[PDB]
Amino acid sequence: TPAFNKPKVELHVHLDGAIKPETILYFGKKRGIALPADTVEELRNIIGMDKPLSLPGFLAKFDYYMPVIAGCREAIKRIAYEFVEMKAKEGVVYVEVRYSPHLLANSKVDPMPWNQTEGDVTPDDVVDLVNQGLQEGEQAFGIKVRSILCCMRHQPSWSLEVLELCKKYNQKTVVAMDLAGDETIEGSSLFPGHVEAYEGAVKNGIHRTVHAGEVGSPEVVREAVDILKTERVGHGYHTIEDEALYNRLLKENMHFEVCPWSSYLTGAWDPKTTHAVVRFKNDKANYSLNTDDPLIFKSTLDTDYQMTKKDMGFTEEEFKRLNINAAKSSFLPEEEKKELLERLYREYQ
Ligand SMILES: Nc1ccnc2c1ncn2[C@@H]1O[C@H](CO)[C@@H](O)[C@H]1O
Ligand SMILES: [Zn+2]
């Protein structure tokens, strides 16, 4: 009984936030790097969350395992290949994964992440590796998968390189650019590196998406929409607080990448108030359901579909409708996007 047993489309899910607990254990032992636990079960409880934390508290979880992956080509390519497999079983036909290429490299990276020792896995080298694994998984499982490179809010200096990686791997799995990281950092959406990269994304034709409103105020969403020029808004829950900006985003048809379970676990959604998605459903807004970081939220695309069905009262029509919108809002090229839409309709009949 999986709430929605039909093809699906996921526009918001981090790759480094969706790794099997078994592969983390495998590379921790093979590299001799420590892990908080030596059992996928105990490793699932240390890395996972059961109750709400905060954006900066949940982001630390990564410190536990990113060092086991970062720097290893074999691991980077493997996690990308298994990610597809995961989404293939979930009944997802098209996905757009997002990850920071700089956080997985150990060479040519401004501030070395995870106290690594210089190596040869460059950032350009990780977009390639992830492209290979994603492509293999595509031939092996049968689902389309494209990627989205992220700009980290705290590291603006990296931003322009992310833009160059996007231009270089355009369509070669890379279809867009994103701005993730700690949203609580004041004025991070305005740092010049980010602003400049997005200005370059607008003139070079690189799609854009921006994590905003997940935990910040409406001003942040307003900056992602007017100054950064997003085409999609990651989360955008708090947007409803500024009635004017919300009704205008509802008019332009802005797409809101929603992640329900994740908003409860990061604290982006007070469980006493009505979830912004309920208002997105009642207003017939353009939005998709996503998983964000299944490994840390101990979830699966189904989790989110069950959470909206049981609470919030979501029906199957709404599930087929928000998925058709996600396919329309995807960053696929027209031709491929048409095929995607041709597929869901045939399967939704
Ligand atoms: N829920 C989230 C909010 C902001 N940033 C996130 C979230 N999930 C993952 N990220 C960040 O995006 C990076 C790339 O996936 C991760 O290393 C993590 O830092
Ligand atoms: Zn996210």
Side-chain angles (χ1 to χ4, degrees):
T1 192
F4 196 51
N5 207 354
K6 312 268 174 68
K8 283 170 221 78
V9 173
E10 191 158 16
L11 267 14
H12 199 124
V13 57
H14 304 257
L15 174 54
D16 47 7
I19 310 187
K20 268 158 65 148
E22 299 83 9
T23 303
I24 292 158
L25 232 48
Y26 171 80
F27 288 106
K29 268 215 139 113
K30 175 176 197 95
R31 293 179 84 192
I33 291 177
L35 265 345
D38 315 293
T39 292
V40 325
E41 274 104 37
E42 245 310 296
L43 180 58
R44 211 183 244 111
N45 290 12
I46 311 289
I47 296 165
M49 303 173 48
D50 262 345
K51 286 114 166 95
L53 253 218
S54 76
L55 194 52
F58 129 93
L59 279 177
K61 300 291 191 164
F62 290 81
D63 305 358
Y64 287 136
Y65 62 87
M66 285 307 278
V68 158
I69 307 309
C72 209
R73 298 165 181 281
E74 175 191 338
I76 295 164
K77 175 150 129 150
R78 200 222 250 206
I79 65 153
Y81 170 93
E82 310 183 331
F83 171 81
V84 179
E85 164 165 26
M86 258 163 53
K87 286 320 156 137
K89 296 189 219 154
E90 276 181 340
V92 169
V93 298
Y94 175 71
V95 218
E96 272 174 4
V97 229
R98 63 183 68 185
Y99 64 97
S100 170
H102 298 81
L103 291 180
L104 289 173
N106 60 196
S107 177
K108 249 85 157 252
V109 194
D110 317 61
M112 196 62 75
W114 324 120
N115 314 107
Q116 281 170 290
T117 5
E118 260 249 348
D120 61 11
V121 187
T122 246
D124 184 290
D125 278 339
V126 353
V127 177
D128 184 4
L129 258 357
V130 177
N131 284 172
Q132 289 181 27
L134 289 184
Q135 261 142 347
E136 298 188 359
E138 277 188 300
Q139 299 157 311
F141 297 102
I143 60 162
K144 187 104 99 198
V145 169
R146 312 234 83 86
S147 37
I148 288 172
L149 307 195
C150 294
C151 285
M152 293 304 147
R153 274 178 193 271
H154 195 263
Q155 296 291 338
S157 67
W158 292 344
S159 294
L160 285 175
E161 191 173 11
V162 169
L163 171 59
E164 287 310 312
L165 261 11
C166 287
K167 284 167 47 180
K168 166 171 169 138
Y169 287 91
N170 210 333
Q171 298 319 313
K172 299 144 119 193
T173 100
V174 183
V175 299
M177 183 183 265
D178 182 32
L179 179 64
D182 203 339
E183 199 187 336
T184 62
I185 290 182
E186 155 117 16
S188 38
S189 330
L190 270 354
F191 293 158
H194 301 148
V195 167
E196 263 141 46
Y198 274 80
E199 304 203 302
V202 170
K203 73 182 251 277
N204 280 289
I206 305 302
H207 286 120
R208 297 144 244 135
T209 191
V210 174
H211 276 83
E214 168 176 24
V215 122
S217 64
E219 174 58 23
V220 179
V221 173
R222 171 188 273 103
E223 287 160 14
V225 168
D226 300 348
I227 304 179
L228 257 28
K229 316 246 161 245
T230 0
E231 310 192 272
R232 297 206 242 125
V233 155
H235 288 288
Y237 308 130
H238 286 104
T239 320
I240 71 195
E241 293 175 356
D242 188 332
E243 286 285 336
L245 166 79
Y246 171 55
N247 266 105
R248 159 188 160 223
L249 256 32
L250 211 59
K251 155 235 135 197
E252 304 173 7
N253 215 235
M254 181 60 64
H255 181 74
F256 295 95
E257 305 162 10
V258 170
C259 317
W261 188 233
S262 151
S263 49
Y264 159 72
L265 256 13
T266 67
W269 169 54
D270 184 351
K272 298 160 207 170
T273 76
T274 264
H275 207 306
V277 81
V278 159
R279 168 118 193 236
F280 288 168
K281 173 198 66 127
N282 289 356
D283 281 349
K284 291 304 141 217
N286 188 192
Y287 74 87
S288 58
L289 257 12
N290 310 94
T291 228
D292 212 8
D293 295 277
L295 164 64
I296 299 175
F297 301 136
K298 293 201 268 201
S299 64
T300 220
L301 206 31
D302 192 57
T303 300
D304 296 272
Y305 278 85
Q306 298 273 25
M307 191 197 155
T308 52
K309 181 180 208 57
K310 256 62 58 63
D311 347 319
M312 297 166 191
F314 266 47
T315 49
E316 178 173 75
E317 336 173 27
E318 185 63 11
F319 285 157
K320 293 156 127 164
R321 190 209 147 234
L322 89 236
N323 274 105
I324 276 146
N325 285 339
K328 306 198 266 171
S329 295
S330 78
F331 292 132
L332 241 22
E334 250 293 295
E335 316 96 68
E336 289 188 85
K337 183 184 277 184
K338 282 201 245 244
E339 301 180 0
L340 215 217
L341 282 158
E342 198 176 300
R343 222 239 228 219
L344 304 177
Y345 266 102
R346 176 194 316 142
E347 239 125 358
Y348 280 3
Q349 286 321 302

